[PDB]
Design a protein around this nucleic acid. Structure first.
Lengths: 214, 243, 309, 135, 214, 139
RNA sequence: GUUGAAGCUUGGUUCAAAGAACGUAUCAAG
RNA sequence: ACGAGAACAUACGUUCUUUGAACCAAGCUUCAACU
């Protein structure tokens, strides 16, 4: 069948991400947040989520280090995320989506915006000559509803595939997501993770759901 | 199916000898004439064609089938990788047979393997007829837009194919998307010029750490100087590096 | 191996982190002389103003600049104050306040980049070739703070003690001392440890004491603020930190390494000399006092609590 | 896209050129001091003017509504009272506010009550910063 | 006897599709979305949609795997999309059409252009060095009004053909449509599906229009 | 398609060689700073100018009409004032603009107000990027 | 003794190098 | 009573696969015109 992974991503701080494609004032924030181009909601691209959980999984699935190539790494990690090696192209079983913001309803109950501006500078360590810049980032407490499709084609490896997509989510829990993460931005968390068959009903849907919501 | 190296394409060849009609309008003059001498020329040319070409295609084991033979009719069909480099040694053998007096107009085209041979022969006879009037010594390569003289072919392309083959097989991460991009910007400079030459300079700069600090300079100056003889050079490099 | 730490800053002296918002006399501040400062809304205040015809105090700022703080409000017949977001107390000895960095909910916090830049000051303390391409600080995975309550904010004014404690007219709202705010830092042990950051913090405070506060205390200095304690040798290994609240020129630039009367000479003349001024040994200090004598706390100073997980 | 400020129109084509000729007028008859002498507006005052605009601009830019928020018009009035304070403080910012029709533009931004009018005002003001820093 | 499958496709993420791969500016966006050269509307070909429909159905009408050539796969797929064998050749009962953007004016009421450029990069594992790519994709929420010709010839298999084309559509609902899909683009959902006769009313269009408009 | 900028008229036949000559005049006669030494314009600011042009060049491509809309000319005037502002802060980029005339070129774009003129300007600016990276410029 | 005294500003870096992707097989050849 | 009459260059086909807009940057430096 096909498995649809559904949860939500709350933000604990920050999440500056991306870069537009739009003019900036003298003024004000250059490098703003990457937004929806239609409804002007912030989004984390599924590419950015894919890149960080792929990097964190491929890092952890070796020992905690990696210096290889994206098409030259583990069989499970290519089984999830795909490859383009000239002999074996493993078709990517996972399929992300762009994740636009969800709780604009309750963030307007506080009469706060969707995003803040971060005044943050550089001090020259020789001369103490400052240099300011403004960074736009998303208000902490924002909830993003994300949806991941998983191609149910095998039976022997799905429990293996859902033990390390859960472990990938748990590794990215303890890390940032996009932008100035080592300076304290982009810390996320995951909750209400649920797996649901798209059409029909896979029989081993229960053991996937408790390996997911653990 | 024997040639599992390059593009699976079949080439044919059409040719004739330059200035042959004037050679028989006034064969030998009065003052240095015996009767018997001018016949030896024509029998040497005919026996050269039949016997020498049969022996030449025998000694270097060419995948070439032959139909005609003569100074007005020559039609051979074969693998393109075997009749493209047979044309230069054909030029050399008829050049030093004639002692550099009578030369060759030739026409070579590239065809699908499943193709009507009458259509091939007509199209390549017309291809040579494009190279025939250009008479002068010349060969056209697969289209009327690519007509080269023999020295231009040999010297210019077969060192600007030998340089490309020598350099790009040393590199594991340039061939051949860079060659395709370089071809795409090179074949489109014919209509708009400073745009493509500037993008060419920028992209030769940005590969100068991979293709070579020397090699990008020859690519730039060759694209400035003689770029029709490099677009065909990269094209036949691409065709002989297929699969 | 990505060792994670619950770094807590106990406020050993008031701390400003700023955020880039300045407030003048009329700007929002209800500094009643009950030792209190109330900052008010931006939207609701102005909405109430033009709903009761804002042109009155638009032009009565013109009538009453400079001094108009609450005398406009308390004698225009509307003394109403739900407009305050929150109130802080004040330390004098009236105006020009810049506020603390907040979240969107108006609840302050120490941003992670501030502590990271403070640590970067207190790590690469060697000769300044450690730079933008330093590979050590690609691994310090510091986080933004726990969002501290509004109750620890109280506004302190800028005062400098060069020869006497001279009160500057700048005010800034700061964390009251002995407020503890936690973080979450992580780093690879292949590049830096607990021991490296521990000893580097200790000897930055050692240099900042023994070359500027020791020389600033053997120059003309009393125990007059009785309380501005020297306080290294009990916590000299206790590795005190200075984060950026007007803590001084020396707390930012690194060049008190190696020696004193070359580097103090070149900065305390020349780097001041490109600004405006001409003065000798030494560079001159930045305290902040509080009340019944004063206490003279050194500004922008905290102590690290490196605890694991 | 109009900004009929006090006498004429500057649209979204020559806001930079209007700032250019306004500043070009400033630095050819610079303000004679009230104590006698010449001064220029310093960079910090004019930068504070720009930041004072751009605090509002950051809130305005990401809301697609052509109607400005009722909260935003209040902040435009706060721009007006802030430049009133600084303008009443010093004479150099007083005639810098006078000459470039700053108050006239900000009143016309109250009058139009459209996002694009504010955006073109901010365009104008950052062009004032641009051509002031160019000289 | 010759029907028209009229509906729409909405875009919920991304969707970069098509594209001349010649050369951009230094400049600017690499690999643009192909547009209609006349009207400058970005469009999906019939080829992209037909290939994606035929790929997914041949995963489901197997069931599961697909390691096959396009010809020798099924009967109910060759009946629809055509085959080109020497003697077991079946004329394609479907005809795909080029599908240009229809709700441009509704985007103009939101005052945005019909496409955006998405800044993406790539982090080398050796060096933590970026490699920025600018990819032009259409915006989400653009509607692609479409019409697919179904040239009816046999009556005993119309119901089966339409119900498996319905499951082809709702199978494509859970997958991307062209381009960088696994990086979070190209997710589509089908709406207002209906079938309408050429001239007059044929017969049993209600059963087809209820199995289609499910 | 003419754009007489400061000394010559640049059609779509003689601009890339003009940009080549202008940069070749720069990296053999460089800017002497007001501090004592030699200053070359950094890659980051000239690229910043480049995508400053490009973020409206990406909108001019998908147009059919020759007279550009008021949105496009608004972004062009904004590019001109940003060129002035970044030019004002550091003098190195200031006489980079004054030496290879963007400002005369961009105001000729503001005069002709046609699609093909802005395309010619864009090809001129990117060719300045190209031959800046090529001759002298570190890669 | 009293009173805001204001000045310095993303400097400063780095960049699609991506890698595969033009290509089959149907009437001819035998 | 046209080297002519016929006779669709047609059928099959995903511009697609792999790629974090990243990295380094304490809203901060100075004390002062001001009995």
């Amino acid at each position: 069948m096909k498995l649809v992974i559904e949860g939500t991503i709350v933000l604990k701080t920050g999440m500056h991400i991306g870069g537009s494609s739009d003019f900036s004032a003298i003024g004000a924030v250059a490098s703003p947040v990457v937004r929806d181009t239609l409804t002007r909601l912030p989004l984390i691209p599924g590419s950015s989520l894919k890149g960080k959980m792929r990097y964190l999984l491929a890092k952890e699935l070796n020992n905690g280090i990696l210096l290889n190539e994206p098409n030259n790494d583990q069989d499970e990690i290519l089984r999830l995320f795909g490859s383009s090696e000239k002999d074996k192209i493993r078709r990517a079983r996972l399929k992300f989506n762009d994740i636009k913001l969800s709780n604009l309803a309750e963030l307007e109950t506080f009469n706060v915006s969707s995003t803040e501006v971060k005044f943050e500078n550089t001090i020259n360590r020789k001369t103490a000559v400052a240099n300011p810049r403004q960074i736009e980032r998303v208000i902490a407490g924002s909830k993003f509803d994300f949806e991941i499709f998983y191609n149910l084609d095998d039976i022997k490896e799905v429990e293996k595939d859902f033990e390390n997509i859960k472990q990938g989510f748990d590794l990215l829990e303890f890390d940032y997501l996009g932008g100035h993460g080592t300076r304290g931005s982009g810390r996320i968390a995951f909750e209400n993770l649920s797996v649901i068959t798209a059409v029909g009903n896979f029989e081993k849907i229960n053991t996937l759901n408790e390996i997911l919501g653990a | 199916e024997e040639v599992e190296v390059g593009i699976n394409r079949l080439g044919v060849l059409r040719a004739d000898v330059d200035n042959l009609g004037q050679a028989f309008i006034n064969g030998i003059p009065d003052d240095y004439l015996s009767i018997s001498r001018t016949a030896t020329f024509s029998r040497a040319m005919s026996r050269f064609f039949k016997n020498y070409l049969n022996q030449l295609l025998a000694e270097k084991s060419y995948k070439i089938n032959v139909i005609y033979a003569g100074g007005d009719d020559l039609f051979m069909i074969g693998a393109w990788q075997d009749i493209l480099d047979f044309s230069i040694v054909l030029k050399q053998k008829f050049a030093d047979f004639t002692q550099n007096k009578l030369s060759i107009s030739a026409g070579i085209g590239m065809f699908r393997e499943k193709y009507p041979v009458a259509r091939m022969a007509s199209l390549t006879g017309d291809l040579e007829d494009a190279a025939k009037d250009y008479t002068k010594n010349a060969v056209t390569l697969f289209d009327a837009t690519n007509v080269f003289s023999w020295d231009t072919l040999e010297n210019d392309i077969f060192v600007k194919l030998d340089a490309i083959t020598k350099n790009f097989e040393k590199l594991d991460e340039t061939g051949k998307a860079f060659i395709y991009r370089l071809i795409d910007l090179l074949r489109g400079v014919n209509e708009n010029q400073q745009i493509n030459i500037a993008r060419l300079a920028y992209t030769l700069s940005r590969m100068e750490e991979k293709i070579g600090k020397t090699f990008a300079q020859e690519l730039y100056n060759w694209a400035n100087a003689d770029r029709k003889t490099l677009i065909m050079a990269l094209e036949i490099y691409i065709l002989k590096t297929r699969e | 191996m990505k060792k994670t730490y619950r770094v807590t800053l106990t406020a050993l002296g008031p701390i400003f982190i700023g955020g880039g918002e300045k407030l003048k006399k009329y700007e929002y501040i209800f500094d009643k002389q009950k030792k209190v400062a109330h900052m008010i809304d931006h939207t609701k205040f102005t909405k109430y103003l033009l709903e009761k015809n804002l042109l009155d105090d638009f032009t009565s700022r013109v009538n009453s600049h400079f001094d108009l703080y609450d005398y406009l409000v308390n004698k225009k017949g509307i003394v109403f104050m739900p407009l305050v977001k929150y109130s802080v107390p004040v330390a004098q000895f009236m105006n020009d306040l810049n506020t603390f960095v907040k979240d969107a909910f108006g609840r302050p916090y120490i941003p992670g980049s501030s502590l990271k830049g403070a640590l970067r000051t207190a790590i690469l303390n060697d000769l300044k070739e450690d730079t933008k391409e330093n590979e050590v600080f690609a691994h310090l995975q510091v986080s933004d703070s726990e969002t501290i309550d509004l109750e620890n904010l109280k506004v302190y004014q800028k005062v400098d003690y060069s020869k006497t404690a001279k009160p500057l007219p700048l005010y800034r709202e700061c964390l009251k001392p002995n407020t503890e705010i936690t973080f979450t830092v992580s780093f690879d042990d292949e590049y830096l440890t607990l021991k490296k950051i521990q000893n580097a913090l200790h000897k930055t405070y050692q240099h900042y004491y023994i070359k500027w506060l020791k020389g600033g205390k053997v120059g003309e200095t009393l125990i007059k603020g009785v309380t501005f304690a020297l306080d290294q040798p009990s916590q000299n290994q206790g590795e005190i930190i200075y984060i950026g609240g007007g803590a001084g020129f020396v707390s930012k630039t690194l060049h008190y390494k190696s020696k004193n009367r070359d580097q103090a000479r070149n900065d305390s003349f020349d780097i001041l000399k490109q600004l405006f001024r001409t003065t000798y040994s030494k560079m001159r200090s930045v305290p902040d006092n509080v009340p019944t004598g004063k206490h003279y706390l050194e500004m922008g100073k905290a102590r690290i609590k490196l605890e694991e997980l | 896209t109009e900004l009929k400020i006090g006498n004429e129109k500057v649209n979204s084509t020559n806001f930079g050129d209007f700032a250019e000729k306004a500043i070009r007028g400033i630095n050819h008859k610079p303000f004679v001091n009230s104590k006698g002498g010449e001064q220029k507006i310093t960079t910090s005052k004019i930068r504070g003017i720009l930041e004072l605009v751009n605090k509002v601009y950051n809130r305005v830019i990401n809301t697609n509504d052509v109607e400005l928020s009722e909260n935003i018009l209040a902040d435009i009035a706060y721009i007006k009272v802030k430049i009133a304070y600084e303008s009443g403080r010093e004479p150099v910012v007083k005639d810098f506010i006078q000459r470039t029709a700053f108050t006239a533009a900000i009143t016309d931004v109250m009058n139009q009550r459209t996002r694009e009018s504010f955006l073109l005002f901010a365009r104008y003001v950052e062009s004032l910063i641009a051509y002031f820093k160019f000289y």
